[PDB]
DNA sequence: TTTAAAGATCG
DNA sequence: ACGATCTTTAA
């Protein structure tokens, strides 16, 4: 199982096996919520259309793809014992928020992701990364995961856009896998959740297979009503895999 | 400026 | 989800 080089929400490693079993075959894979791209790294499609609303994430992916060796060498400098402390961390965080260079920001972004608290990615309304120091014993430098991402990225396009705009890139050769932010058990609104389901029903009308993963609640069961539902056993909340087969 | 509730900040 | 301390919002 290929691991992403980033700490990210919805890694979904345990249920990667369930995704592949319910994900149809096609020429191209479309991911509106690529995130860490665990599905992308653990599937084998000819082409990939990978999208996310996070511009720092998308910019990082483009840098890693086009400038792999240059990036790895520069980023590896950050992962040494001297940079594993609060004072250095907050200066690099400040440098990141003030940097105008995409390459430099991409380098610092990996450092912040690995040395920051819980591997979180949080911004204020000023667009500034404000995750505190994580204080780990020894953050891991994902060199192998980086090179593996770069090689697989050669068959992928990265776009920074909302799900509605990325799913419209899908055609008949396409297969769409959606991994939206989790639905409430008691940002991403409820309207966007239902809208995603409606867009899915639109694609399946044009003979485009769509697979959506989410929590198994009352709202999600209602939203994905027109889909072939599968429940995976993970309060005790299970996950739901909604399949819109043409 | 006042006021109260709400939202935002960031360790 | 936490919490003290900011800013925001509307009459
Ligand atoms: C919970 S993560 C899942 C990522 C991915 N499935 C993985 O394996 O890491 C969902 C991602 O969707 C992106 N996202 C959030 N809201 C979005 C929106 N309204 N439109 C498009 N993408 C969005 C976020 O940047 C986030 O990284």
Return the HEC string of chain A: CCCCCCCCCCCCCCCHHHHHHHCCCCCEEEECCCCCCHHHHCCCCCEEEEEECCHHHHHHHHHHHHCHHHHHHHHHCCCCHHHCCHHHHHHHHHHHHHCCCHHHHHHHHHHHHHHEHHHCCCECCCCCECCCECCCCCCCCCHHHHHHHHHHHHHEEEEECCHHHHHHHCCCCEEEEECCCCCCCCCCCHHHHHHHHHHHHHHHHCCCCEEEEEECCHHHHHHCCCCEEEEECCCCCCEEEEEECC
Of A241, A220, A8, the closest CA to residue A119 belongs to: A8
**Quick one: A143 and A96 in the same domain?**
yes
The alpha carbon torsion through A216, A21, A180, A176 (nearest 10 deg) reads -140
Q: How many domains does chain A have?
A: 2
Mutational test site, ligand 1, from A1, A33, A121, max ligand atoms within 8 Å of CB: A33
| Technique of determination | X-ray
Measuring alpha carbon to C1', the residue closest to nucleotide B10 is A130
What nucleotides of chain B have any atom within 7 angstroms of a protein Cβ? 8-11
Residue with tokens 């409820």: A190
| CB count in 10 Å sphere of residue A167 | 24
For β-strands A210-215 and A228-232, DSSP reports them as unpaired
In degrees, rounded to 5, the angle at the alpha carbon of residue A163 between the alpha carbons of residues A174 and A106 is 100
**CATH value at residue A114:** 1.10.1020.10
**Quick one: A150 and A161 in the same domain?**
no
- In ligand 1, the atom with minimum distance to the C-alpha of A192 is 19
Residue with tokens 């055609």: A171
* C-alpha–C-alpha distance, residues A59 and A62, integer Å: 5
Resolution in A: 2.4
Mutational test site, ligand 1, from A35, A145, A163, max ligand atoms within 8 Å of CB: A35
**CATH value at residue A39:** 3.40.50.150
**Quick one: A63 and A136 in the same domain?**
yes
CA dihedral for A23, A61, A32, A141, sign (positive or negative): positive
Instruction: Note the CA–C1' distance, A123 to B8, in angstroms.
Output: 11
For ligand 1, whether the C-beta of A16 sits within 6 Å is no
Nucleotide nearest to A86 (CA to C1'): B11
**Quick one: A50 and A66 in the same domain?**
no
Residue A175 in contact with residue A209, Cβ under 8 Å? yes
Cα(A87) to ligand 1 centroid in Å equals 31
Of A52, A47, A68, A51, the closest CA to residue A5 belongs to: A68
Measuring alpha carbon to C1', the residue closest to nucleotide B11 is A132
The neighbouring-strand residues paired with A212 are A178, A242
Give the distance between the most distant pair of CA atoms in chain A: 56
* C-alpha–C-alpha distance, residues A149 and A145, integer Å: 6
Residues 6+ apart with CB under 8 A from A119: A6, A7, A8, A113, A134
For β-strands A174-178 and A228-232, DSSP reports them as unpaired
**Quick one: A87 and A150 in the same domain?**
yes
For β-strands A47-52 and A28-31, DSSP reports them as parallel
**Quick one: A93 and A172 in the same domain?**
no
**Quick one: A176 and A228 in the same domain?**
yes
**Quick one: A175 and A92 in the same domain?**
no
* Residue-number span of the structural domain to which A50 is assigned: 1-54+155-246
* C-alpha–C-alpha distance, residues A179 and A31, integer Å: 8
Last residue of a domain, one of A128, A154, A180: A154
Residue A177 in contact with residue A28, Cβ under 8 Å? no
In degrees, rounded to 5, the angle at the alpha carbon of residue A62 between the alpha carbons of residues A27 and A210 is 30
Of A95, A161, A111, the closest CA to residue A7 belongs to: A111
- In terms of Cβ atoms closer than 10 Å to its own Cβ (0-12, 13-18, 19+), residue A236 is exposed
């Amino acid at each position: 199982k290929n691991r992403a080089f980033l700490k990210w929400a919805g890694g979904k490693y345990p249920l990667l096996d369930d995704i592949k079993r319910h994900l149809p075959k096609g020429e191209c894979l479309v991911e509106p919520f690529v995130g860490a791209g665990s599905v992308f790294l653990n599937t084998d499609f000819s082409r990939y259309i990978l999208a996310d609303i996070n511009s720092d994430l998308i910019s990082l992916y483009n840098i890693v793809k086009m400038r792999t060796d240059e990036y790895v060498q520069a980023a590896r400098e950050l992962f040494v014992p001297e940079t594993n402390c609060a004072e250095v961390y907050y200066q690099f965080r400040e440098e990141f928020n003030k940097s105008q260079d995409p390459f430099r920001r991409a380098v610092l972004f990996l450092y912040l992701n690995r040395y920051g608290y819980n591997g979180l990615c949080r911004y204020n309304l000023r667009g500034e990364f404000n995750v505190p120091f994580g204080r780990y014993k020894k953050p891991y430098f994902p060199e192998a995961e980086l090179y593996h991402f770069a090689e697989k990225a050669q068959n992928a396009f990265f776009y920074c856009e909302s799900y509605a705009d990325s799913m419209a890139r899908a055609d008949d050769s396409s297969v769409v896998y959606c991994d939206p932010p989790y639905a409430p058990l008691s940002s991403f609104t409820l309207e966007q959740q239902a809208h995603l389901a409606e867009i899915a029903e639109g694609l399946v009308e044009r003979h485009i297979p769509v697979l959506i993963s989410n929590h198994d609640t009352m709202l999600t069961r209602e939203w994905y009503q027109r889909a072939k539902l599968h429940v995976v056993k993970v309060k005790k909340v299970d996950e739901l895999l909604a399949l819109y087969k043409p």
